Ligand binder design. Structure first.
Ligand code: 8CZ
Length: 150
């Protein structure tokens, strides 16, 4: 019973979380997941400031109100070569990665590793935070509050 959470650097408190190496998070699960990191879904303004500090990914993820990809450099296979916060307009499907916002993070680029999941609750799942540099933090718990996400 295991969940891998791949996380990034934080940029003005914003970071990306990919679950089990595939698009697999619902909007309800995304809010609960960010809550386990003492974080919330970023607002579009928070995401734009993170972008301006150096944040970009090549994955769709939830923010408040939309599913987006922050882009700095044009890349043909990432958001159809767009720059800025690219907003997903048309999709049949509901599951993506998520972005999260931690207000107590440093103001600009923070590429230190994440070493805790401070606000998960009691549960049976082995949750493993996986950093980009491979370092890991694991703990037994749960973060999903909606049964349909389990
Ligand atoms: C534990 C941790 N490791 C690096 S920063 C940091 C922290 O204070 N957080 C609140 C983390 C859990 C959020 C991912 C930003």
């Amino acid at each position: 019973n295991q969940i891998d959470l791949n996380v990034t650097c934080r940029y003005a408190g914003v970071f990306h979380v990919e679950k089990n190496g595939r698009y697999s998070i619902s909007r309800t699960e995304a809010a609960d997941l960010c809550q386990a990191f003492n974080s919330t879904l970023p607002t579009m303004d928070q995401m734009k400031l993170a972008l301006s500090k150096g944040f970009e990914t090549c994955r769709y993820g939830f923010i408040e109100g939309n599913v987006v990809i922050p882009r700095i450099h044009p890349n043909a296979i990432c958001a159809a070569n767009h720059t800025g916060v690219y907003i997903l307009v048309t999709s049949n499907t509901s599951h993506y990665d998520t972005y999260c916002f931690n207000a107590s993070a440093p103001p600009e680029e923070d590429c230190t590793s994440v070493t805790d999941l401070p606000n998960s609750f009691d549960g049976p799942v082995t949750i493993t935070i996986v950093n980009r540099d491979g370092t890991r933090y694991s703990k037994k718990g749960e973060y999903r509050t909606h049964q349909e996400d389990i």
